Curated annotation (Swiss-Prot):
Protein name stated in the entry: Protease 2A
Record field: catalytic activity: Selective cleavage of Tyr-|-Gly bond in the picornavirus polyprotein
Binding site for Zn(2+) 1: 50, 52, 110, 112
Subunit structure comment from the entry: Homodimer.
Role of this protein: Cysteine protease that cleaves viral polyprotein and specific host proteins. It is responsible for the autocatalytic cleavage between the P1 and P2 regions, which is the first cleavage occurring in the polyprotein. Also cleaves the host translation initiation factor EIF4G1, in order to shut down the capped cellular mRNA translation. Inhibits the host nucleus-cytoplasm protein and RNA trafficking by cleaving host members of the nuclear pores. Counteracts stress granule formation probably by antagonizing its assembly or promoting its dissassembly.
From-to range in the entire protein, with total length: 869 to 1008 of 2193
Annotated source species: Coxsackievirus A16 (strain G-10)
Domain of life: Viruses
Cystine pairs: none
Catalytic residues identified in the record: 15, 33, 104
Length: 140
């Protein structure tokens, strides 16, 4: 579990979004596994605006923050799960690291701020949904 709180926005994995999130929906994309909902309170996270390929992510299944190298956002084949059939997920970045389904929502960050959240994994590889292209998160 986990979310990014930037301004009056809440960014979560689409497959973990709540009823309040769907009721207060701003934008969602099934192919990115992302959902953004509105909030009444202001958040304190900063979204990175960069091309960094190194950062640190939180892994709740180990209670640890791991430094990683990750690939640039791309269209990747993702195996079926209880949340989606087998499909291609867009804007996804991979790293060599540990992850379990419950780790989704863990933040990946670089020196410029939040890069994305854990979204896929298995076989010693962890995938993160990129948020750095969503410029509107910094305004209105
Ligand atoms: C973070 N992580 C996801 C894992 C999965 C796959 C899985 O449960 N999901 C849920 C939806 C997500 C998606 N975006 O398609 C994939 C299997 C094994 C280890 C995993 N570590
Ligand atoms: Zn950066």
């Amino acid at each position: 579990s986990g979310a990014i709180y930037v301004g009056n926005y809440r960014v979560v994995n689409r497959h973990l979004a709540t009823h309040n999130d769907w009721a207060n929906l701003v934008w969602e994309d099934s192919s990115r596994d992302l959902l953004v909902s509105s909030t009444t309170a202001q958040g304190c996270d900063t979204i990175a605006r960069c091309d960094c390929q190194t950062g640190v992510y939180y892994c709740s299944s180990r209670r640890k923050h791991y430094p990683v190298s990750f690939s640039k956002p791309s269209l990747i084949f993702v195996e079926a799960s209880e949340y989606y059939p087998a499909r291609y997920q867009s804007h996804l970045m991979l790293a060599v690291g540990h992850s379990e389904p419950g780790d989704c929502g863990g933040i990946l960050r670089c020196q410029h701020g939040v890069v994305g959240i854990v979204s896929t994994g298995g076989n010693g590889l962890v995938g993160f949904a990129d948020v750095r292209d969503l410029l509107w998160l910094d305004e209105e």
